[PDB]
Symmetry: C2
Subunit: 198 residues, 2 copies
């Protein structure tokens, strides 16, 4: 049972890394078979299909993202500092993405938006976790006098997500961290100047 | 004739581009390109040596289309800030009318090519560098005219604008709502008008 659970874990883990780089359609099952020692058969002992593996792999990738944000946001007391910590998680993707190939939420978004309802919904669910996190921080901050009462929480969330993800895209194309540094500095300054209260 | 061949190539490249924009390069099979062009495989590869060369030509086509769209969007403004905000407005207009079916081909090709294909990556980078040069030229013009604060870092602004607007294109498509593009536009237009514009 342990062998099974660990072999499933290495299959999903390696699948997620390869999918994150070449996409679902462009990652050949044979290469995942190759990357897991299953070149002579047996990947279907753990998954019914490549599509089921894709969903499991995305869930794995989403868990890594979730862990990166949970660690990044822990320990801050002031709600604005916590929101800035959220920016810093994305900032750190320039050289340290959640897994090889960059942000799997951004990567899967581009592939699935016009091709795959189930992956679309899984991407949207993660985006919605992020919106909920920011909404809750803004609400608590407003209540504590740390954030201005007029701040539109979801508008702020959508701006942060768009800016940081677009910068993640740019940083891997331009092969430099500078877009992420600039996007971070812009939003941190904006937040401190226009969102923060005390 | 050679004229007919040049036209046939144009048609194939245009159809390939639309398919690749949706399903990607690896996910678009030659049989899909056949169906969309009404051509047999041999009819396509008479004009292209390979799927790879076709993919490159299809991107160059997508790049030119994006270029035309910015060209019309940016033409004729009387103030450099108006011109920079019109660059945002081009992206905002993607909400209902992307440059081609399936969204921004620069964004879409970036995500696929960045860790897979040096030649497409270089082409994507060249497009991003054109946008950066456009915005830098406008910023230096505006500074010369007293329209833009001299302290404005042009390339910092360019990369912020591109990151924001492209991230919003991604979000608007995945959330199935224009709202992220509208918010991004408003945020940047307001920021530029309040902090970049001098007079
Ligand atoms: Mg797409
Ligand atoms: Mg990629």
């Amino acid at each position: 049972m342990r062998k099974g659970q660990e072999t499933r874990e290495r299959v999903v883990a390696q699948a997620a890394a390869l999918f994150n780089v070449s996409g679902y359609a462009g990652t050949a099952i044979s290469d995942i078979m190759a990357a897991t020692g299953l070149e002579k058969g047996g990947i279907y002992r753990h998954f019914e299909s490549k599509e089921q593996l894709a969903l499991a792999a995305f869930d794995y990738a989403a868990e890594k993202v979730r862990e990166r944000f949970a660690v990044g946001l822990a320990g801050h007391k002031h709600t604005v500092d916590t929101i800035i910590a959220f920016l810093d998680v994305f900032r750190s993707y320039a050289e340290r993405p959640p897994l090889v190939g960059g942000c799997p939420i951004l990567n899967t978004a581009i592939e699935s938006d016009d091709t795959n309802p189930m992956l679309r919904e899984r991407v949207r669910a993660v985006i919605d976790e992020w919106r909920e996190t920011i909404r809750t921080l803004v609400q608590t901050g407003i209540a504590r006098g740390e954030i201005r009462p007029e701040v539109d929480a979801d508008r702020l969330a959508l701006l942060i997500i768009a800016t940081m993800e677009g910068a993640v895209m740019l940083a891997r194309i331009l092969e430099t961290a500078t877009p992420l540094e600039h996007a971070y500095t812009h939003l941190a300054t904006y937040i401190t100047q226009q969102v923060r209260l005390a």
